[PDB]
Short mmCIF file of C-alpha atoms in Angstrom, two decimals:
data_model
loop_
_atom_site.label_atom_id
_atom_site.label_comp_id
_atom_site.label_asym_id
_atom_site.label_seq_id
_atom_site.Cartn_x
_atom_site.Cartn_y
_atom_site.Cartn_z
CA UNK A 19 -58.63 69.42 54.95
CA UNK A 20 -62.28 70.88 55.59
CA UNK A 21 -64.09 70.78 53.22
CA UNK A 22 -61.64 68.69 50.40
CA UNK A 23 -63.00 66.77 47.89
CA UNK A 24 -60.47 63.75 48.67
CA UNK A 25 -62.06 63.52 52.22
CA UNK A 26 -64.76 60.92 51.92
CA UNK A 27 -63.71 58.91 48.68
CA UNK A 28 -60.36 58.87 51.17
CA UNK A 29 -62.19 57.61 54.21
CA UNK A 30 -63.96 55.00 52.15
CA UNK A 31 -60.87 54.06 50.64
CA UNK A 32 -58.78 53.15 54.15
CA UNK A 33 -61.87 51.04 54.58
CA UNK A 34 -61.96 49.66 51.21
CA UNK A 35 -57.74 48.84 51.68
CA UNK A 36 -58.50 47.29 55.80
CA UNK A 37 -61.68 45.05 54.62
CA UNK A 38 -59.32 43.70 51.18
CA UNK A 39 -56.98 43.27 53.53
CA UNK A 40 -54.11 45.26 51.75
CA UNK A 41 -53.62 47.16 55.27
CA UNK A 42 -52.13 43.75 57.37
CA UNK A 43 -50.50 43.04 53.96
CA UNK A 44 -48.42 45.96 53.92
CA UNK A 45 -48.16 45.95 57.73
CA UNK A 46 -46.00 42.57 57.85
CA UNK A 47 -44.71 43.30 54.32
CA UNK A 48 -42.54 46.20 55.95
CA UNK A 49 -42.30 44.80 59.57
CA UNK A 50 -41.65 41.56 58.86
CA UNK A 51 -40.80 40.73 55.93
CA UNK A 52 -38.22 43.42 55.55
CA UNK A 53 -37.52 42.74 59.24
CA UNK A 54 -33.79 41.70 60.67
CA UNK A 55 -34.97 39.54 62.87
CA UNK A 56 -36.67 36.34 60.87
CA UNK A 57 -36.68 34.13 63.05
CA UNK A 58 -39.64 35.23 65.33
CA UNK A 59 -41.97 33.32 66.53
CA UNK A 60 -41.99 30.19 64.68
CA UNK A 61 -38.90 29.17 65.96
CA UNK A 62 -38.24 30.43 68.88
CA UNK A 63 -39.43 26.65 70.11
CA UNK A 64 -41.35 28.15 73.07
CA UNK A 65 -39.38 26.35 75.89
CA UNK A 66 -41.23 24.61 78.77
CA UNK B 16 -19.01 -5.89 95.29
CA UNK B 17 -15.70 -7.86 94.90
CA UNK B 18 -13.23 -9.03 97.86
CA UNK B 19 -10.94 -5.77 98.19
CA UNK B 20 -9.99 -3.30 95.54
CA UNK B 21 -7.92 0.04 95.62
CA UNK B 22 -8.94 1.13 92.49
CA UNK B 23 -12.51 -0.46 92.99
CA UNK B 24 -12.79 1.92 96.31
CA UNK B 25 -11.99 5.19 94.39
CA UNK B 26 -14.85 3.93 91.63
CA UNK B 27 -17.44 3.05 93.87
CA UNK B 28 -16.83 6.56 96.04
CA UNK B 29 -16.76 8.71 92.74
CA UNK B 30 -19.74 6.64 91.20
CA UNK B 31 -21.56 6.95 94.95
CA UNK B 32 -21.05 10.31 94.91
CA UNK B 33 -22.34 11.22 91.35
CA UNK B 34 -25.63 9.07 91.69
CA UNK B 35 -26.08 10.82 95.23
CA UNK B 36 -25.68 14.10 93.90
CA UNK B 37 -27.83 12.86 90.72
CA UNK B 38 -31.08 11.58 93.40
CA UNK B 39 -30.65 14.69 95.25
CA UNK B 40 -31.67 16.74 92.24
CA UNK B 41 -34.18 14.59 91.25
CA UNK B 42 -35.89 14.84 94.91
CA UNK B 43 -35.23 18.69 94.90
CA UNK B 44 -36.37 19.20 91.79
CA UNK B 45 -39.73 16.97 91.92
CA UNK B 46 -40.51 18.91 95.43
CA UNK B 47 -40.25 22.07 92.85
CA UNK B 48 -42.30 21.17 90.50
CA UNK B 49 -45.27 19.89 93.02
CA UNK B 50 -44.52 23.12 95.05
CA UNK B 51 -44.65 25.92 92.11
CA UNK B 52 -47.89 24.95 90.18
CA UNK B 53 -47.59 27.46 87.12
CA UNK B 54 -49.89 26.59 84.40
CA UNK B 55 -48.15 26.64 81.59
CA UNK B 56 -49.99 28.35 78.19
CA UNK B 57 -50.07 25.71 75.17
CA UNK B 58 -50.11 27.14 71.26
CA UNK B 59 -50.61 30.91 71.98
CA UNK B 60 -50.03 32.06 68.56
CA UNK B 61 -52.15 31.45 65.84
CA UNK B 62 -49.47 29.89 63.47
CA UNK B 63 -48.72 27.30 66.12
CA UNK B 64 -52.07 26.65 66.30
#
């Protein structure tokens, strides 16, 4: 909200969590990780 | 390549027919490949890499 008192120490924090790296952490904790499908990338074998 | 066979025919026409159909493909598909010129993108991902 305008004018809250969590508003910057909030907008430094997101920084403070996206620099540590926390952010991408979290992102492939709960999309990945926790995801169905393991097998992704890695061994798909990328036929050619 | 011995004298007269009946069974020898019927090996030699299967077997001719197999390795035609098998240099046919290999022609066909070696005009493909030096027709279609796709380069091909090595290690995209940075865990491959």
């Amino acid at each position: 909200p305008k004018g809250s008192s969590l508003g910057t120490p909030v907008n430094l924090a997101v920084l403070k969590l996206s620099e540590q790296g926390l952010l991408d952490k979290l992102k492939n904790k709960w999309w990945y990780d926790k995801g169905e499908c393991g097998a992704k990338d890695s061994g798909s074998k990328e036929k050619t | 390549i011995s004298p007269r066979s009946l069974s020898g025919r019927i090996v030699g026409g299967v077997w001719w027919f197999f390795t035609l159909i098998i240099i046919s493909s290999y022609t066909a598909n070696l005009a493909a490949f030096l027709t279609v010129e796709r380069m091909v993108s090595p290690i995209e991902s940075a865990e491959d890499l």
